[PDB]
Amino acid sequence: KNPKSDKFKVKRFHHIEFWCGDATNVARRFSWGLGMRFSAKSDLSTGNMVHASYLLTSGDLRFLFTAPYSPSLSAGEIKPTTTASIPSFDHGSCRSFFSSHGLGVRAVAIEVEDAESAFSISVANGAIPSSPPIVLNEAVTIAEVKLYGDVVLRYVSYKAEFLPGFERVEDASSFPLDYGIRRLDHAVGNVPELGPALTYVAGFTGFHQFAESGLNSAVLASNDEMVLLPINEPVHGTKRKSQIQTYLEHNEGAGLQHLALMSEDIFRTLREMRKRSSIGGFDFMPSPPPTYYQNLKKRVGDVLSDDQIKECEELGILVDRDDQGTLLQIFTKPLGDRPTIFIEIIQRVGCMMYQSGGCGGFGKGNFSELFKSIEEYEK
Amino acid sequence: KNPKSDKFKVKRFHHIEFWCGDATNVARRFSWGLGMRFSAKSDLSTGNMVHASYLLTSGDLRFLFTAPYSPSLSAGEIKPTTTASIPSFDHGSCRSFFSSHGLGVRAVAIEVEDAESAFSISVANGAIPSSPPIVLNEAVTIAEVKLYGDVVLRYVSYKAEFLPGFERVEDASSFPLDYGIRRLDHAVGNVPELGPALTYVAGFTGFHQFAESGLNSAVLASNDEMVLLPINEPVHGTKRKSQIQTYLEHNEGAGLQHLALMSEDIFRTLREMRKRSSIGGFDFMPSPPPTYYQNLKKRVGDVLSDDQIKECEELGILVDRDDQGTLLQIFTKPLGDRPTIFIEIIQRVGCMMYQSGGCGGFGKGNFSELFKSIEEYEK
Numbered sequence: 001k002n003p004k005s006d007k008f009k010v011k012r013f014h015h016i017e018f019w020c021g022d023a024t025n026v027a028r029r030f031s032w033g034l035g036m037r038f039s040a041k042s043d044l045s046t047g048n049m050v051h052a053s054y055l056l057t058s059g060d061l062r063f064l065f066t067a068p069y070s071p072s073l074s075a076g077e078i079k080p081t082t083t084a085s086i087p088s089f090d091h092g093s094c095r096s097f098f099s100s101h102g103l104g105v106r107a108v109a110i111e112v113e114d115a116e117s118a119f120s121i122s123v124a125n126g127a128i129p130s131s132p133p134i135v136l137n138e139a140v141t142i143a144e145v146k147l148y149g150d151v152v153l154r155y156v157s158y159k160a161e162f163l164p165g166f167e168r169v170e171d172a173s174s175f176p177l178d179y180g181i182r183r184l185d186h187a188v189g190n191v192p193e194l195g196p197a198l199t200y201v202a203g204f205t206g207f208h209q210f211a212e213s214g215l216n217s218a219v220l221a222s223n224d225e226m227v228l229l230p231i232n233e234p235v236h237g238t239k240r241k242s243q244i245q246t247y248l249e250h251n252e253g254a255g256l257q258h259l260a261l262m263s264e265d266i267f268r269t270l271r272e273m274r275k276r277s278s279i280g281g282f283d284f285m286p287s288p289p290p291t292y293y294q295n296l297k298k299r300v301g302d303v304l305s306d307d308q309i310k311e312c313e314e315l316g317i318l319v320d321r322d323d324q325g326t327l328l329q330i331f332t333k334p335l336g337d338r339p340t341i342f343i344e345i346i347q348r349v350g351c352m353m354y355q356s357g358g359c360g361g362f363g364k365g366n367f368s369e370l371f372k373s374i375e376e377y378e379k
Numbered sequence: 380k381n382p383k384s385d386k387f388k389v390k391r392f393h394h395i396e397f398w399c400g401d402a403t404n405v406a407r408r409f410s411w412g413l414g415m416r417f418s419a420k421s422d423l424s425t426g427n428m429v430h431a432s433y434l435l436t437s438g439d440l441r442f443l444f445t446a447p448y449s450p451s452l453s454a455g456e457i458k459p460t461t462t463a464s465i466p467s468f469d470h471g472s473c474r475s476f477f478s479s480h481g482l483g484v485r486a487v488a489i490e491v492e493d494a495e496s497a498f499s500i501s502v503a504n505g506a507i508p509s510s511p512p513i514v515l516n517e518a519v520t521i522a523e524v525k526l527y528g529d530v531v532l533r534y535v536s537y538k539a540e541f542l543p544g545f546e547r548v549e550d551a552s553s554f555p556l557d558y559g560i561r562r563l564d565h566a567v568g569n570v571p572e573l574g575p576a577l578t579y580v581a582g583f584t585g586f587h588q589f590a591e592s593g594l595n596s597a598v599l600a601s602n603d604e605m606v607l608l609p610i611n612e613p614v615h616g617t618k619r620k621s622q623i624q625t626y627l628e629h630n631e632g633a634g635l636q637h638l639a640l641m642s643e644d645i646f647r648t649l650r651e652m653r654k655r656s657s658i659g660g661f662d663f664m665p666s667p668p669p670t671y672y673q674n675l676k677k678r679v680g681d682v683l684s685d686d687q688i689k690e691c692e693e694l695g696i697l698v699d700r701d702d703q704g705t706l707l708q709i710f711t712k713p714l715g716d717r718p719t720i721f722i723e724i725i726q727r728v729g730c731m732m733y734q735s736g737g738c739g740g741f742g743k744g745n746f747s748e749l750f751k752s753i754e755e756y757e758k
């Protein structure tokens with residue numbers, strides 16, 4: 001049931017912005033770890049005296065890393081005369097965010113038909129404004145509203161290259177890494193209370209609900225369900241403490257928990273990333289025990305060959321299936337010092353019409369199948 | 380002329396500690412960029428609720444990356460009950476340092492015979508105390524005094540493995556990278572006024588002076604001249620603005636400008652690092668024009684073959700020579716967002732007795748030779 005109730009025209013995920021203490025080191029680690037190319041920059045070398053911002057791209061995935069310079073470099077400026085390429089940026093907000101949360105996602109950015117109208121309509125419908133719409137070089141409009149915690153939903157719209165004042169980075173500094181990642185599939189928030197968070201966000205977007213865990217969840221989706229925003233809350237009382245509660249504690253409250261990155265070939269992606277785990281890239285969660293992969297034949301031997309099922313097992317991939325498609329997924333260990341944000345790599349198979357959004361779900365069945373796997377391996 | 384006036388027994392450089400906003404991402408970038416192995420950790424997984432600290436090693440070089448957790452994780456603790464492995468660590472100091480300076484060196488650590496005596500004697504001789512001596516698990520004593528800006532000189536002494544409460548990292552997470560770097564040769568500070576800085580530091584250590592630039596400098600050395608601490612001040616009025624003044628502006632004052640890392644084979648090191656420049660490692664300063672390498676034969680054709688001189692030119696290595704030894708050197712671009720700290724890779728040839736410290740100097744003659752090179756290449 002898709003009521004198609006978006007209160008404004010949403011297109012697709014546009015970029016994710018990390019607020020960093022040092023954008024250079026985070027962007028370089030991510031580039032090597034995820035196989036993303038340095039695409040654009042806005043920093044001192046481009047006249048930005050306010051923040052250093054580095055854009056990595058892989059397919060349609062856009063990861064932006066931003067850190068503040070010393071405020072002294074821009075002490076003379078005012079908002080009308082700012083050299084910041086992202087006018088929403090604030091030194092105090094950025095430093096406060098990073099000291100409070102550590103490395104994390106500041107903005108989930110979605111492309112819309114008209115960012116001014118999206119902001120207007122959202123705020124008229126309960127959205128807490130974060131940064132009013134501003135037009136950049138008469139070409140791009142950007143506006144921000146609070147999403148949850150200190151994470152903003154960022155609207156971007158183009159009348160008609162990332163953002164004005166960003167420059168394309170030199171080919172000598174841009175090595176064409178590509179491990180197969182292609183787009184952002186969904187971005188997941190953790191909140192203390194799911195009900196109020198859902199009511200707030202679905203309230204101002206018109207996004208619709210998309211049809212001992214330690215958590216409860218729900219997924220908000222745009223009209224074509226290409227912008228998917230799951231939200232988790234903890235469940236208290238479990239024997240094992242809720243991973244959402246640990247997140248909230250270590251993050252100092254609500255924030256973005258994981259980014260799901262769609263791969264055009266998850267096996268190549270996971271081979272390429274696992275090769276680099278101990279040489280500056282990302283670690284992955286412990287693999288499921290071989291019991292899990294034996295039980296895979298009875299569940300998805302329809303969709304995957306035994307050769308491909310054993311390829312999952314060597315890479316530690318998880319597999320789930322809806323009533324419509326199959327989901328291949330795996331999770332990294334936390335991206336930085338705190339047990340907060342991590343990445344999920346996914347590939348979806350089925351639901352060809354192009355592929356419809358959410359095909360195969362989000363792996364909810366892998367909770368049950370994993371604990372059953374824990375019991376069979378112990379035996 | 381070496382008066383051998385150390386007021387306490389100094390051994391050798393022990394480690395360099397970076398204060399980070401996220402230690403994980405900086406440590407991983409550095410590991411891959413410099414070919415340093417993850418050696419030890421102190422973080423949540425080791426019971427440290429205060430700071431995440433990661434130790435990279437290459438030979439005798441020890442790079443430590445530290446970042447604060449949320450103070451809430453340790454809100455119940457007091458200094459007597461702290462889970463911090465580095466008792467000098469302070470959340471407020473660390474956050475203030477990183478918001479003020481960005482990514483930078485907090486501590487230059489030297490091993491001494493008795494850290495308590497070194498602190499006592501230093502403070503009795505004008506050193507501004509930073510952290511009083513503390514004994515760790517009856518095994519290691521650590522104390523800190525101000526060096527310049529917010530950089531501390533850290534004394535470490537062992538009665539008799541990095542520090543108590545650090546754990547050796549699992550071999551699966553420790554890939555044996557090695558590009559040939561072996562030890563810290565010197566650590567360089569930038570200050571607004573060289574005179575007072577020298578007087579202060581030489582005052583409390585007894586270290587002796589080691590015998591249009593835009594700067595003035597001087598090198599303080601321990602008794603055997605294995606601990607070398609150069610200090611720069613700007614020279615105002617130059618046509619091209621002083622790089623020391625730019626440092627001071629972007630760093631918000633005095634701090635560590637560069638770390639010189641000795642390589643057992645600078646050609647292998649520079650090949651390995653340059654391979655990784657655009658895939659998450661470090662960039663290098665622009666090479667000197669081929670004029671410079673032609674003029675190399677007339678200056679060091681004694682010490683290096685023409686095959687090795689052309690190997691310098693492809694890697695962009697600089698060469699200088701004292702009256703005693705030859706110095707091979709190259710500089711990275713800044714390590715993070717701000718034009719502040721960078722790394723120098725060096726190899727020294729000559730002065731065998733082991734090799735005496737400072738053999739070949741520090742490249743001071745490469746200022747003159749470089750501008751003469753600029754003039755000949757233009758012709």
Ligand SMILES: Nc1ccc(CC(=O)C(=O)O)cc1
Nearest residue numbers: 186188216217230362363364
């Ligand atoms: N119950 C539940 C439903 C959906 C999600 C979304 C998601 O992306 C993930 O968990 O990987 C999470 C939990």
Ligand SMILES: Nc1ccc(CC(=O)C(=O)O)cc1
Nearest residue numbers: 565567595596609741742743
């Ligand atoms: N004049 C002068 C003398 C020594 C140094 C020390 C050093 O390490 C470097 O410059 O690379 C710097 C400048």
Ligand SMILES: [Co+2]
Nearest residue numbers: 188260344362
């Ligand atoms: Co997910």
Ligand SMILES: [Co+2]
Nearest residue numbers: 567639723741
């Ligand atoms: Co040097």
